[PDB]
Amino acid sequence: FQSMMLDRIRVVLVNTSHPGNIGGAARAMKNMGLSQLVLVQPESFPHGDAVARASGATDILDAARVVDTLEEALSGCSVVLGTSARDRRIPWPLLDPRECATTCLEHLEANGEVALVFGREYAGLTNEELQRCQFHVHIPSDPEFGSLNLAAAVQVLTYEVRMAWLAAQGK
Amino acid sequence: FQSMMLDRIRVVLVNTSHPGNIGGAARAMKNMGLSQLVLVQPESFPHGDAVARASGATDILDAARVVDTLEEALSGCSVVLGTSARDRRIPWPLLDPRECATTCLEHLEANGEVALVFGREYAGLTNEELQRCQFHVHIPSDPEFGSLNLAAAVQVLTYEVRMAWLAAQGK
């Protein structure tokens, strides 16, 4: 199963401070066909704001796994891609969201499990967290005002994943 | 000017009910280089929630024009593109976000002014509002759970606009 492939994209939110962003991320995942959410040390979860921003994606919140470390969140993944909003001076392969989606599909088609890792509001992932990833993904943005809202960033990546998944089906 | 071209994309939010979405839209515009926001009959504006979700894109909120009708919001535009989340049974040309961005760039390069029109949370634009547009833009989504958060939808379209704008510059 085709739609079922999308369940093997593991969205990992690292140390999210605003519970509204957890809900927003779940909504962004559900409206692209994704469903697997993992939270590393969220600051406030469960929370009413996550439920409200999920706007019906409460199934994803209820099935979300909450873990103490990024290592636990990445267990069993065939590849890990971390997002970066700025030059991090780490020489890892740097992908745009379209290239990220191509890499994701390649793994999903090979029965892999892909982690897409998002960091804290503003600060992003730490260097150590980025070093744990095999690829870095950057959403091209205005360098004068470069970091997107966490849920909006999840939406951009999940949208590209769905665009690649549709294209592979001749759709 | 190149960056200046993006100021000629007019983001129009029609009858927004959650002020947080107005702020989220302004943030989504600013981190892609856009700045022109027009609000048609927003339910609560100005509002603290718009300021909070703008996360520093308060300049866009302060310069936003508030009007009573969609007609006033579209004055002087060379083309109007409206978003749709479902089959609207209106036979207008239907573009995905990449095709929307191509159309936008074509107009910006020809010193045009493009309106990107977003509707109400859940309900979207009315048929009459969609009929006022020359093109309809649909973000491919899971038809089981098809409508994105308003600010996340603005982010998807603005992200594609920036991707097209960068590509045209050999970047």
Q: How many cross-chain Cβ pairs, A to B, lie less than 8 Å apart?
A: 83
Query: To probe the interface with B, which of A7, A96, A145, A163 has the most B CB atoms within 10 Å?
Result: A145
Resolution (A): 1.6
Q: Please state, in angstroms and rounded to a whole number, the distance separating the CA atoms of residues A14 and B111.
A: 43
H or E element: which one contains B14? strand B9-14
For residue B7, the tally of other CB atoms under 10 A from its CB is: 14
| B96 neighbors B41 (Cβ within 8 angstroms) | no
* Cβ-defined contact of B162 to A148 (cutoff 8 Å): no
B34's tokens: 């856009």
Number of Cα atoms under 13 Å in the Cβ half of residue A148: 31
A145 bridge partner residues: none
Phi, psi (deg, nearest 5) at residue A101: -60, -40
Please report residues of A whose CB lies closer than 8 A to that of B61.
none
Dihedral angle sign, alpha carbons of residues A155, A156, A158, A160: positive
Torsion (CA) A24, B124, B156, A155 in degrees, nearest 10: 20
Longest dimension (CA), chain A: 43
Phi, psi (deg, nearest 5) at residue B82: -110, 145
Please report residues of B whose CB lies closer than 8 A to that of A97.
159
Domain span holding position A98 = 4-171
State the total domains in chain B.
1
When CB atoms are compared, the residue of A30, A96, A156 closest to B156 is A156
Exposure string for B53-68, b = 16+ CB within 10 A, e = fewer:
bbbebeebbeebeebe
Chain B: give the shortest CA distance to residue A56, in Å.
9
A18's tokens: 């605003």
When CB atoms are compared, the residue of A98, A151, A166 closest to B140 is A166
| A96 neighbors A137 (Cβ within 8 angstroms) | yes
Residue A76: exposed, middle, or buried by beta-carbon count in 10 A (0-12, 13-18, 19+)? Answer: exposed
Cis peptide before A46 (omega within 30 of 0): yes
| A24 neighbors B20 (Cβ within 8 angstroms) | no
Q: Please state, in angstroms and rounded to a whole number, the distance separating the CA atoms of residues A70 and A43.
A: 15
Cα–Cα nearest to B27, from A83, A161, A151:
A151
When CB atoms are compared, the residue of A145, A155, A163 closest to B31 is A145
CATH number at residue B65: 3.40.1280.10
